[PDB]
Amino acid sequence: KVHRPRRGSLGFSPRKRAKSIVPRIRSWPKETEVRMLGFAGYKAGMTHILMIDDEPGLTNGKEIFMPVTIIETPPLRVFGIRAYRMGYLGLETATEVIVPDFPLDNYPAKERKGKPKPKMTFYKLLERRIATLPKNYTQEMFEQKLGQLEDMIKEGEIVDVRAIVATQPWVIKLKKKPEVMEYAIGGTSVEEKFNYIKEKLGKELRVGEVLKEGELLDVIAVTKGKGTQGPVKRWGIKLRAHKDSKGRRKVGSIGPWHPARVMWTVPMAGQMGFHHRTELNKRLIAIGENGKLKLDENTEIEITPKGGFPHYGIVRSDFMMIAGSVPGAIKRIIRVRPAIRPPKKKPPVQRPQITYVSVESKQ
C-alpha cells in the first residue's frame, strides 16, 4: 500500500477549550542571575521593519524585511510573596503573604459633571479578581507575617519562593479587572530570592528592568478561537472524491471491523483554536518607552501606526517589539519567559540595526 504521515499530531490532545484564559507556565529556565523570569503584556498588533541581520546564517550583514509584533506592557505590580516546601510527591505551598492596602495613584481618574474624583485605591481593583480580601489588615500584621515567613526560610522548610504580581489594564485604559500571576525568580539561594521579592513588594516592575533586548524568549498565550471545525480544517484530511454523493469534507472510514470500536486517533470534528500554546525561541527586537521608539539617539517615533492599531487603541505605555507572530487574538494577555531550550549559536544580546520602521496605516 501507499504510505504517508498521519493527518495532524497526537501530541496536542485533547483539543479542548483552554482551562483558563490566563495562560499557565509549567516549567521555568535555570538562570544564575537574580531576576524575575518573565513578564506579561497585551497583544496590540503587527507591523514590519527593515534591519541589518546579525543572526548567523546566509543573510548576515544584509538588510532584510522582518515582521514584528507589538505587546503593550504597562508596569506590573508586585503584591505577594509565596513560599514552597518539599512535599511527599512534589512542591507544596507553605505560606503566602500579600501587602496591605495602599493608595493607587496611577489610576486615570476623570472629573465628570458632579461628584469629586473617585479617589481609587488598591484592594478595590483587585476585588474584581479575588472578591475576598483581608480586612483590618495593618502594617504590623504584614510585618509579623513576613517575619514568620523569613523564620521559616531560616529553619529551612522552604525550598522555593515566588512572586505574586498583578496586571494594571487601567493605566493604559484597556479595562479594570486585573490578572494575577505567579512568577518564579531566577537564582539559587532562597534567601537571595526572598530579599529580591521583599524589596519590591508593593512596588512596580518595568519590562525594561526585567528583560534584555535581543534575547530569546518563549511566548505563552491562548490562541484565537475558531469554534467547531470539521476534520478537513481541524486535522488536514484530504477531500473525498468529487463524485461522492454523501459529502466531501468528511473522513471516509472511521475504522476497520476489528477492533470493534472507534479508535481515539481517527480525525473528528470538535473545538479548534482557543488552546494553550507555547512558542519557543522568539527574539526580542526592542523595548520602547511610553509608546515611543528611539532609533539613533536623536530620532524617536511613535510606534502606533496612523489611525491606530486595528481593533485596538493607541500604545501609550512601555511595549515590546518581538520578531515574528505570536498566538492570541487582539488584546489577549501574553506571557513571556526567557528561552527555555535556546539554540547553541544564539544571536547577540543587543538591539539590531533598524533602518526603517513601518508606521503607515495598517487598516
Place this chain on the structure above:
Amino acid sequence: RFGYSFQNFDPKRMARASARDLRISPKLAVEVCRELRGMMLNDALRYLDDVIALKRPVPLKRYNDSQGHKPGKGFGPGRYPVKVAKAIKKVLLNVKNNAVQKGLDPDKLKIIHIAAHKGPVLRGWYPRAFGRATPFNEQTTHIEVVVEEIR
C-alpha cells in the same frame, strides 16, 4: 373523570379543583406540576406567569430528549411550556375561588397535592408515502389539585 388521588381530604382545611380533557401535552404538564407541587398558591401563580412571559425556564427531569440547556444554575434541560402553563393557571384560579368561597384565606394556601394524568386519545390519520396512512393523535390531560390553609 371525577375522582381524586388524594387520601385525607377534608372540607374544613382543604380546597380542590380539577380539569378534564385538556388539549395539552401530558408530559410537559407532569414536568410543570413537579415544580408546582409544594408551593404557595400566589408564588405558583407568579411562577406560571413568568413561564408564560418567557422569563423563567421550567427544568426537565424525565422527558428531556434533544433539549438544549439554559443560562443559570441547574440547567440542564429546560423549556417554556406556555400552553400548559396557561391551562394550569385556570385550574389554580379555580381552586383559589373554591377556597375563598369555602372561607379559607387565599394568602395562606399551600399546594399540598397536584397531579396530571393522561386522558382519552383523539384519533386521526396522516397520509404518508407509498400508500401508507399513519396515526396522528391528540393526547388530552387531566389535572387535579388540592391546597391546604397553613396555620
Place this chain on the structure above:
Amino acid sequence: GSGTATFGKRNSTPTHIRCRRCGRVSYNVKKGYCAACGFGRSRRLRKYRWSKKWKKKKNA
C-alpha cells in the same frame, strides 16, 4: 408510468352505469348489457351456481 399518472385518465365515460332491471351499477353502456343480471342480452336472469351474491341478497 402504469401507476398514479395512468390513474388520472379515468375521466372518460364510465364502463358501467345503473341497470334498469337489477338496480346495480353494472350495466355495460358501450356494449349494452349488464354484467350482473344480463339485462339487454338475456331474457332470463344471469345466475351461476358458483356465484353467491344472489343468495347473499336474500340471506339464503
Place this chain on the structure above:
Amino acid sequence: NTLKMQRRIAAEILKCGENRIWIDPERIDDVASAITREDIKRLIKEGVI
C-alpha cells in the same frame, strides 16, 4: 363581516377587477351594514366605495 360579497358586487357594478375597488377605511361599519346591491350602489354614489 368579511366584505367579499360587497367587494365582488361593487366590482361587477363598476365593471372592473376586484383589486381596483377602494373601500373607505373609516366607513367599514356602513360597508358591512349595506347588504343589498341597492345599498352598495348607494355607497358607491356617496363615495365610500
Place this chain on the structure above:
Amino acid sequence: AIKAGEEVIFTVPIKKIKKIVPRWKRAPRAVKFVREFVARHAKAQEVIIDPKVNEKIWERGIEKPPSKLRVKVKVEEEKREGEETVRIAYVTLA
C-alpha cells in the same frame, strides 16, 4: 429620561442587523430593530411606528433598508384600565 409631551431626535443605526439575517429578511428585521431600539431608549411599554416611517424603511425593497434612520420620538402616558401608567412612544420621520 424622556417626559410626556416632549419630543426627541434619534438616529437608529439599522446597519447593525444587516449581516445577521438573510438579505431578503432585512426590511422587516429593520422594522423590528427600530421598534426595539425606540422601546429601550424611551423606556416605553409600547411604541407606535408611523406608516410614513414604515414606507421610508421599505422604500428600496425588502433587501435594502436604510443604513441609518432619523426619527422623532414623543412619549405619552396612558394610565387607562388601571394597568399602571403604560408609556406609549410615537415614532415619526425626521
Place this chain on the structure above:
RNA sequence: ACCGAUAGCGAACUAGUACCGUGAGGGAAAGCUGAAAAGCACCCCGGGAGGGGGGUGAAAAGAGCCUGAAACCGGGCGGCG
C-alpha cells in the same frame, strides 16, 4: 347432557348495512344506568368546555352510565439510591 356477545348464522342492534374493486364480486365493527329519571333545582368561578359547593338515589350506578382485571401512566407511602 348445543352457544352465551372475539362464542352462536356474516348479521342478538337503522346487516348482506356501512365501506373496497371499472367489473365479475368481496364485506365489517357495534348488547347492559337505575326499582322509579327521581336524568342534579339553586350558589361561586370560567370566553366556553366544564370545576367547586349543594341536592336525587339503598348504592352515582351521572348518561363518556351493571361489575371495572391486566398491560401502561401520574401522586403518596416503605426500601435502595
Place this chain on the structure above:
RNA sequence: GUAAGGUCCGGUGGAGCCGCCGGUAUCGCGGAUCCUGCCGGGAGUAGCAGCGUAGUCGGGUGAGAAUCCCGACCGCCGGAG
C-alpha cells in the same frame, strides 16, 4: 397440599352459587415471523425547506389575532398562477 390446587380472613358487588356420587364435552397456554382488541420504549423526536424563499406599518373586530377585515407600501405570475 411434594403439586395440579383448595379453603379461610379484610375490601368492592348487588344475584345467584357450591360439596359428594354417576355420566357427558368446542374441557386446561408462552410460543405456530399464530388470530382479534388494547397499551408501551423509539418521542415531545422526524417531518411541517429544496420545484414560485413574502410580507410590513397604522386602524377594526373579538374573551382571545403572525394567520380574519379595510388603507398604504413592498412583492410574485403575467403565451398563465
Place this chain on the structure above:
RNA sequence: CCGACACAGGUGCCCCUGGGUGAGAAGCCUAAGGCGUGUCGGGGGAAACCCGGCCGAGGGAACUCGGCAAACUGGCCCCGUAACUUCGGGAGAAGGGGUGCCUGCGGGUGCGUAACCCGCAGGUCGCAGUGACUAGGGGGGCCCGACUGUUUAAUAAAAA
C-alpha cells in the same frame, strides 16, 4: 375531477393573449386581471456538515475505467472555406474582421419629411458595445447500423 390526501403526478394547453427590447407565441421588465393559500411562524457572524449558486493566484487532465461535472464558443453583417462524395452534400467545415451612443446625409417601396427596411461620413465614451437577457465550441482516425422512425410503462434506447 382520478390517483386512500387541501398528492410538485395525470386529466385540460381544451379554446384566447396589451406595451418595450427583440425574427419571434423565446428570455427579461411591465399594463389589465389575479394573488400574498405552490400556507407553520420567530431568533442568529448561532458553528461543523449537507444540498442549490458565484468567484478563485501559478500550472492546465498530472484526476479518473473513461475530460463524469464544469469551462471555452455563442446573435447578426462581411470576407473565406478542406479530405471525401451517391454531385444533392460535407457547410454555419475550418479560419479572420466588425458590432454602443450622438450629429447629419444618401437609397428602396411609397402622394407623403406617414410606415418598414438598406448604406455612407464625422465626433465621442469604457476593461468590456449580440455590455443584461437570448445565444453552436472545434478538428482528425476506426467498428457497427444506410437514412427519418420503433422498443423491454418501473435498472438495458442499443450494433436490437
Place this chain on the structure above:
RNA sequence: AAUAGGCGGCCGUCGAGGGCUCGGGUAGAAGACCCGGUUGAUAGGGCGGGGAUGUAAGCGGGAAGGGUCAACCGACCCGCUUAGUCCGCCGCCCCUAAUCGCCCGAG
C-alpha cells in the same frame, strides 16, 4: 489522583459568595467563556483621525454638426472638485441606554 491534594483570605456555628435580568465579543450550535455595568467610555450619538472607490448633484463654458447656418438641440469634455458616497476600524465628549426587580445559598 478513593491516600478524592496544598496555601492565603472571607463567611457560619441574619448571612460571605453566586444566578436570572442589562450594554457588548478577546467567545460561541444550546450551555459555557470574556469585558463593562454610574465605583462608567460597554454600545448608540456628535466631532476628529485613518481608510475604500474615484471627482457627485447643480451651474458656467466648449463640443462633431443641424437649424432662418438665428433662437434652440447635441453624445461627450473642461472648472467649482482629492470631490461626493460609505466605512462590520481608531481617539475625545456621559448627550442617550447599561435601570428597576426577582431567586439560590453553608449554618
